[PDB]
Design a protein around this ligand. Structure first.
Ligand code: CA
Ligand code: CA
Ligand code: CA
Ligand code: CA
Lengths: 90, 159, 39, 141, 372, 39
């Protein structure tokens, strides 16, 4: 089975490269330049925090998505045991 | 109509009473049945945004008289199925959670050890015999552990 | 030439991947034909 | 002829309920404690901001944050994707079990519509007094 | 789960019904597509008078009933007798009540618009199913082999078809139908085997010629120098033991039977054969899509199961196709249920829910709704 | 370029030969794993 090796390259490289740009496209949208530079002095104040919140915003979500996978990872472990237990080739 | 039977048999006057008040608001004109449009309005008030297809499917789910509308009877049926599904989901969720608490070692099982612990962890007074007994009764596949399936079964009923 | 040389390396690599992905299914095969002739 | 055997079963139940009862009270403990961990984690990774002086600082900090944002955002994204991957892995497993058993309890994805209790609350607001669950009602005394 | 468990898949054939639950890997129910009507009045011991018989009880009791086939060449010809086979499928075979199960049904390649509307009329108005859907058979076969463009050679009990499909849409003007299939093929074996000096005299002799065809028949590649081989008489021969001892031998005819699918002239048919027809379908399609169809000849149906069918077809169309082309004949092992499996997949799918025709759609749009 | 184009066509042809020689052994396989699970 070595004629399938060319399938590995094509496949993997393909999917991986597809995923990349998508991530780039996506991430790019959610990005609005720090255009506001030297337009006011107290502006920075009302600005800086807004960025701060956005960060905290993202941070908090990342934490949740995280805890989520863990919980899901456990759903799996169990869902796998139910699969084996429910084997009985009898 | 047979469904509208047990359905109304299931609910209480209290239930009907409120499900009516609720039904009335669904029904604009006050004619006697929710239309594919009268429903759409309430759905949005409820925070959804169904499509013509989606709405009908939701309608003809309890439309026994092929009317294309829902009467306070077909409605009670609908509320019932829901009431059911709701309670089922809440149950399995709770148990699901309980299993994770009892598991803790995360092997996806509950071995006689953990069973003892958790049991002994309750206020109740118990001796090993009790613990191993509950294990033997619960473990149907006689493999020593208690799988989620078995746990669902064993807890079947208990509150 | 650089275009065709690039396409020759991708096909020759997609290749040892195919040629190998097989030794495995043809060998899983002499095996999975022998046990049913036995049962 | 095992006349007493009846009491044995009741015990398991008494115990089972002693278990569940235990579960629930432990369930909310872990829950809140969990949250505590969440606010501590956030406690240091993004502590109560304190706006600097005026000149270079505000600008600098702003640049600092803004860059971190693209950073954290990327991480947030990668994470979301590992979730997607995961949810995917269990959906497939949530299949390999269906067509091997049938509809089984506790599917991992759970397609849930809003509860009737919700719809009722949502529509009548104040007057919605029925702790509906299952308890039927038959004449009292 | 409501309907994840609950979707039914019923594939109606000329010879067999295949049925079961979307989700399963194979049909829960497979049985003849007959409806027997008793020629005389009387009863079996312990039963009452029965007006009708369906499936295997009609086959088993065939001597006292007049057997009838509702589906002639893949098309439903008698709607009274079809509603009888459906009734049997739901209530006895799958033992489900239909009024709480979505039902995915299949139809044939150029099934008349009016029929797709009629079985919808009967599904919703006499069986009261929640929702239903009619898929085209070749299209489910293709899809069950993963893809969306290809050409299916589909061959069962009463019809053979070629249905070129492009990104899911079966191409009406390129579809070919050849009315010679496994039924025709069992009757031809019958004669070349009586002609070998035999007698399939009682009904227990008749039925098993079909089990000879299934077990021992072959499609040889180079059917030319296979007859030549027959003559030198190698250990090519094959004896089958009948219901009793009567060991019958079949050496040669073993492959003379599927050579009928490439040469219809073996049976007084003047039509072209399977491989030429694959090809003609293909030179009737758009030019730009012909490389796709050629690398995706998916086979499905009971009669395409004869071993070496794929190799013969492989070489049959390579040698008719322009050499610049890639030929590729996909023939999966489960192919006698491709159609069904494609329906099981599709109907259990996460995205299919929004194509189910519901009683809401129907009571509001008339049979026209599902007809598309 | 003509040298490398000549070597790309030999590898791409040695190829559809390998890729196809397989559809046959992997399909002979779903088959030769299905009859022993049945027998
Ligand atoms: Ca109204
Ligand atoms: Ca109505
Ligand atoms: Ca454990
Ligand atoms: Ca166990």
């Amino acid at each position: 089975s070595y004629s399938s090796y060319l399938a590995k390259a094509d496949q993997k490289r393909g999917k991986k490269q597809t995923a990349r740009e998508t991530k780039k496209k996506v991430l790019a949208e959610r990005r609005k330049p720090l255009n506001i530079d030297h337009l006011n002095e107290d502006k920075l104040r009302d600005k800086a925090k807004e960025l701060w919140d956005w960060l905290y915003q993202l941070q908090t979500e990342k934490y949740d998505f995280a805890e989520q996978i863990k919980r899901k990872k456990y759903e799996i472990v169990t869902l796998r045991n139910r699969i084996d237990q429910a084997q009985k080739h009898s | 109509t047979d469904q509208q039977a047990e359905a109304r048999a299931f609910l209480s006057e209290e239930m009907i009473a409120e499900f009516k008040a609720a039904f009335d608001m669904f029904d604009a004109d006050g004619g006697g049945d929710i239309s594919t449009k009268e429903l759409g309005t309430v759905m949005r008030m409820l925070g959804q945004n169904p499509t013509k297809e989606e709405l009908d499917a939701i309608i003809e789910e309890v439309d026994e008289d092929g009317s294309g509308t829902i009467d306070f009877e077909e409605f009670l049926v609908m509320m019932v199925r829901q009431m059911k599904e709701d309670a089922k989901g809440k149950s399995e969720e709770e148990l699901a959670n309980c299993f994770r608490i009892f598991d803790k070692n995360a092997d996806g099982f509950i071995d006689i050890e953990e069973l003892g612990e958790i049991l002994r962890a309750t206020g109740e007074h118990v001796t090993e015999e009790d613990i191993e007994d509950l294990m033997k009764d619960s473990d149907k596949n006689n493999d020593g552990r208690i799988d989620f399936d078995e746990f669902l079964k064993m807890m079947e009923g208990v509150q | 030439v650089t275009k065709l040389e690039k396409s020759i390396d991708d096909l020759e690599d997609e290749l040892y991947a195919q040629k190998l992905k097989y030794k495995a299914i043809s060998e899983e095969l002499d095996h999975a034909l022998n046990d049913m002739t036995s049962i | 002829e095992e006349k007493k055997r009846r009491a044995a079963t009741a015990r398991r139940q008494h115990l089972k309920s002693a278990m569940l009862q235990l579960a629930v009270t432990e369930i909310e403990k872990e829950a809140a404690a969990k949250e505590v961990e969440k606010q501590n984690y956030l406690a240091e990774h993004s502590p109560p901001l304190s706006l600097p002086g005026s000149m270079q600082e505000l600008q600098e900090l702003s640049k600092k944050l803004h860059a971190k944002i693209d950073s954290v955002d990327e991480e947030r994204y990668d994470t979301e994707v590992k979730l997607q991957k995961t949810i995917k892995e269990l959906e497939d497993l949530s299949q390999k079990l269906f067509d091997l058993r049938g509809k089984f309890k506790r599917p991992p994805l759970r397609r849930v519509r809003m509860s009737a209790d919700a719809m009722l609350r949502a529509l009548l607001g104040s007057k919605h007094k029925v702790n509906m669950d299952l308890r039927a009602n038959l004449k009292q005394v | 789960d409501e309907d994840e468990t609950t979707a039914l898949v019923c594939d109606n054939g000329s010879g067999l019904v295949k049925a079961g639950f979307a989700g399963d890997d194979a049909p829960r129910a497979v049985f003849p597509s007959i409806v027997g009507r008793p020629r005389h009045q009387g009863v079996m011991v312990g039963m009452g008078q029965k007006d009708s018989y369906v499936g295997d009880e009609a086959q088993s009791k065939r001597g006292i009933l007049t057997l009838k086939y509702p589906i002639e060449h893949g098309i439903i010809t008698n709607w009274d007798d079809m509603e009888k086979i459906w009734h049997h499928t739901f209530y006895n075979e799958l033992r489900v009540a239909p009024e709480e199960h979505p039902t995915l049904l299949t139809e044939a390649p150029l099934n008349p618009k009016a029929n797709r509307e009629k079985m919808t009329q009967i599904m919703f108005e006499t069986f009261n199913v929640p929702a239903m859907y009619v898929a085209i058979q070749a299209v489910l076969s293709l899809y069950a082999s993963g893809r969306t463009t290809g050409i299916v050679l589909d061959s069962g009990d009463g019809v053979t078809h070629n249905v070129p499909i492009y990104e899911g849409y079966a191409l009406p003007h390129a579809i070919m139908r050849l009315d010679l299939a496994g039924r025709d093929l069992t009757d031809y074996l019958m004669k070349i085997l009586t002609e070998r000096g035999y007698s399939f005299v009682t009904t227990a002799e008749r039925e098993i010629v079909r089990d000879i065809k299934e077990k021992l028949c072959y499609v040889a590649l180079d059917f030319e120098n296979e007859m030549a081989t027959a003559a030198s008489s190698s250990s090519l021969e094959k004896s089958y033991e009948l219901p009793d001892g009567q060991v019958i031998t079949i050496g040669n005819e073993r492959f003379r039977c599927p050579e009928t699918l490439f040469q219809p002239s073996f049976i007084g048919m003047e039509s072209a054969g399977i491989h030429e027809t694959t090809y003609n379908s293909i030179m009737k399609c758009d030019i730009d899509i012909r490389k796709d169809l050629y690398a995706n000849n998916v086979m499905s149906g009971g009669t395409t199961m004869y071993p070496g069918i794929a190799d013969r077809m492989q070489k049959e169309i390579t040698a008719l196709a322009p050499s610049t082309m890639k030929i590729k004949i996909i023939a999966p092992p489960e192919r006698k249920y491709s159609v069904w499996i494609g329906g099981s997949i599709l109907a259990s799918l996460s995205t299919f829910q929004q194509m189910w025709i519901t009683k809401q759609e129907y009571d509001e749009a008339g049979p026209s709704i599902v007809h598309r």
